[PDB]
Structures are given as C-alpha cells and as structure tokens.
Design a protein around this ligand. Structure first.
Ligand SMILES: Cc1cc2nc3c(=O)[nH]c(=O)nc-3n(C[C@H](O)[C@H](O)[C@H](O)COP(=O)(O)O)c2cc1C
Ligand SMILES: CCCCCCCCCCCCCCCCCC
Ligand SMILES: O=Cc1ccc(O)cc1
Ligand SMILES: O=Cc1ccc(O)cc1
Ligand SMILES: O=Cc1ccc(O)cc1
Ligand SMILES: O=Cc1ccc(O)cc1
Ligand SMILES: O=Cc1ccc(O)cc1
Length: 347
C-alpha cells in the first residue's frame, strides 16, 4: 500500500499540495525557435496536473544559459506569455506548478547564443560535446568576474519576478546536476581564489545570493532549491565538497524554503564522501521539507517517506512513460517502463 503518497502535504502557509507526488523537472527540448513554450507543451503539462506539484523542465534565465536545443526561457515577454498558457492550463486542471530556473554555466554552448562567452566559476572545460547534436564541442569557460556574478544574481531575480506574470506557483532554483550554481559548490569546477572560492562559506556564497535575491522577489514559501551534494553529472568528485554542503545546508534552513530537492538519477547509489546516499546525507544535515528522487517506484518511495527518509517524492522517467502516473498508482494499475526512445514524443 502506498496510501501515504496521497496525503495532503502543507508546504507552508502559502501552498498545500494535494498529494506527495511531484513531477520531476524533465528537459524535453520542445520549445519553439524563440524558446517560447508551445501549445503542445501546454497540453503535456496540463495532463499531469494530478501531481501534487509539477516542477517544470529547466528553464533558462537569459541567452548565455542555453546548452541544449529548444529549451524554454523565461526572460522575454513572449516566453512569459507562453508559460502563462501552461500555468493557466495546469491550474484549470486543479494542479500546481513551479518553474525550474536554469543557468548551465560551463555546460552552455555558444552555438545557441551567437558565439558569446560561456561563463563559469573557473576556466575548467568539461569533456566532450552537446548530446544529441552534431559536433558542438564544449569550450573553455570564462571565469566570471564579480561584476558578471552581480549580473547573474540580478538575472535570476528578474527571471523570478517574471514567474509572477507567467502565473507559476513558485520557483525551483536549479542548484543541481553540475549546472551553474552547482559549479560554485564543487571543487572540480570552482578553483577560485576570491570571495567566491576556497572555503565552504565562499563557495556557498553564490547559491545563497541567488536564493536570497529570489526570496526578495517572490517569497520563501514560493522558493525551492535543487542540490547535488554528490558529484555525478558533468562534475568530477572531490573529497572536500562534503564540507561545503555541511555549511550550506544549515544556512539554507535559515531561509525556510518551500523545499530542498535532491538532484540524482538513482538515489540507491552510495557516495563515500557523503557517508551514504545523497538523500540520507541531506536528511542528516537539514531538517525541513525534503524531496527525494531517483529510481524510486511508488512502493519504495512510499516506504522511504514512511521511514522519515524524505517528505515528498519526485518522479521523472515514469511520468514520461505514463502521463496518467498518479491515477495508475492510485488504482494499482500496470505502469509502462520508460525507455529513452520515448523522448522523441511529447505526450
Ligand atoms: C530526459 C530527462 C531530462 C531531465 N531534465 C532535468 C531537468 O530539466 N532538470 C533537472 O534538475 N533534472 C532533470 N532530469 C533529472 C530528473 O529530474 C530526475 O532527477 C531523474 O530522472 C531521476 O528520477 P527518475 O528515476 O524518477 O526518472 C532529467 C532526467 C531525464 C531522464
Ligand atoms: C536524457 C536521458 C538520459 C541522460 C543521461 C544520463 C545523465 C546522468 C548520468 C551521468 C553520469 C553518471 C555517472 C555517475 C558517477 C558517480 C556516481 C557515484
Ligand atoms: O541577457 C539577458 C537578457 C535578459 C532579458 C531579455 O529580454 C533579454 C536578454
Ligand atoms: O548524443 C546522443 C546521446 C544519447 C543518449 C545518451 O545517453 C548520450 C548521448
Ligand atoms: O512565485 C510566483 C508567485 C505567483 C503569484 C504571486 O501572487 C506571487 C508569487
Ligand atoms: O537531459 C537533460 C537534463 C537537463 C537538466 C538536468 O538537470 C538534467 C538533465
Ligand atoms: O514516443 C515514442 C515511443 C517510443 C518507444 C516506446 O516504446 C514508446 C513511445
């Protein structure tokens, strides 16, 4: 029995979720050439409105954030209007939805933004080329200046302002999976020697400035944050990263966020540096609402939540394979297994 997945969950005084099931953020690369959400995307999200909360696909805050084709933005008026169609449709279906605010940092590619500079904490290139594209090899980033950083914080904040007009219920800040914010939090990517590098406090500074700037626009009850304390996605490991997160997590708790959400693909994986799984590490260092994710079945998620491992379950791939995931779980019906080939279709 997975009855607990259907518990009401009060995130805070502003938002109550009708169940504990989140749609995980899932990049689909289906926005139009102006990175405006399409009417097909409207229908796609609308049919998943039985989720307690949808986290949108990663949505770029400005042009030099783009690293994959046709990933939507939230920085132009047309993009805002396109997202308003999405959020209106989700709300009309009785759902709720947060936008996931993205900057890819060193994982951006200048093909998408007129040959401009890729930005990151340090001039540390990742290996390889953009997946599913022809020959877009990653480039050495420019190490951001403090002025670049001020502009990036400003643009995260402006993107958050824009979510009001776009009609989202809130923002998940994408601080995970090797992207810009996570790049400041890990030694592989952050080799800085200024006030944004070196020590846990300094390496956490960018993340906290972005969190605080966004709270100043939309409020703590509408702000969540995804983190990846375990390096796995465009990030080499470093044994010193754990103490960065040991500092960051209690600082985050002071902000009384809507949630922290783990970014991982299989949370059954143990990280030596974290003393175990990513979720168990965070749960041991953070005492507010936690969203688990990564290769959970409804059954294993339900058990984890019953065992106080985390509070809410995000479901990714099964929500692609099963638009009616929530109803099928509710009714104990067969679920289709995900395959990567399903990404070809937006259903
Ligand atoms: C096709 C695909 C795209 C994804 N896009 C994002 C993304 O936009 N933002 C993000 O934070 N995670 C992204 N993820 C990771 C998922 O949110 C999730 O953490 C992962 O799929 C594990 O959960 P699952 O086992 O339920 O699928 C993506 C995963 C997949 C498979
Ligand atoms: C878009 C569909 C599939 C996406 C590709 C996979 C992305 C996640 C895996 C990346 C690297 C994982 C290897 C983990 C190393 C460290 C584990 C302790
Ligand atoms: O470069 C950032 C940017 C922000 C808002 C826009 O409308 C266009 C670009
Ligand atoms: O470049 C195509 C590609 C597809 C799936 C992957 O997992 C990796 C790369
Ligand atoms: O963060 C989104 C938001 C939406 C409606 C509001 O009234 C305030 C904030
Ligand atoms: O596959 C695309 C992808 C984008 C953002 C993520 O965080 C993870 C995966
Ligand atoms: O939408 C494409 C698709 C591909 C393979 C499947 O098994 C199901 C759907």
């Amino acid at each position: 029995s997975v009855e607990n997945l259907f518990d009401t969950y009060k995130l805070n005084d502003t938002i109550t979720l009708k169940n504990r099931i989140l749609m995980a953020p899932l990049t689909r690369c289906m926005a139009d050439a102006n990175l405006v959400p399409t009417d097909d995307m409207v229908a796609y999200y609308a049919r998943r409105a039985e989720a307690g909360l949808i986290i949108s696909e990663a949505t770029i805050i400005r042009p030099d954030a783009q690293g994959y084709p046709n990933t939507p933005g939230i920085f132009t008026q047309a993009q805002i209007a396109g997202w308003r169609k999405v959020t209106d449709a989700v709300h009309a279906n009785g759902g709720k939805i947060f936008v996931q605010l993205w900057h890819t940092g060193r994982v951006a590619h200048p093909h998408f933004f007129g040959g401009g500079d890729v930005l990151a904490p340090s001039a540390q290139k990742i290996e390889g080329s953009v997946p599913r594209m022809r020959e877009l090899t990653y480039v050495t980033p420019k190490a951001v200046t403090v002025e670049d950083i001020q502009g990036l914080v400003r643009d995260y904040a402006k993107a958050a302002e824009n979510v009001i007009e776009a009609g989202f219920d809130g923002v998940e800040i994408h601080g995970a999976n090797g992207y810009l914010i996570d790049q400041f939090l890990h030694h592989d990517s952050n080799r800085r020697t200024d006030e944004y590098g070196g020590t846990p406090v300094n390496m956490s500074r960018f993340a906290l400035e972005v969190v605080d700037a966004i709270i100043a626009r939309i409020g703590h009850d509408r702000t969540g944050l995804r983190i990846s304390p375990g390096a796995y996605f465009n990030m080499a490991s470093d044994s010193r990263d754990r103490v960065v997160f040991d500092y960051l997590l209690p600082e985050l708790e002071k902000r009384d966020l809507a949630f922290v959400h783990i970014g991982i693909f299989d949370d059954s994986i143990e990280f030596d540096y974290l003393g175990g799984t990513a979720s168990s590490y965070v749960r041991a260092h953070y005492g507010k609402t936690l969203v688990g994710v990564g290769s959970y079945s409804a059954e294993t998620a339900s058990k984890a939540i019953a065992e106080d491992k985390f509070d809410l379950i995000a479901i990714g791939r099964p929500f692609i394979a099963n638009p009616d995931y929530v109803a099928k779980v509710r009714n104990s019906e067969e679920l289709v297994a995900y395959s990567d080939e399903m990404l070809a279709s937006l259903i």
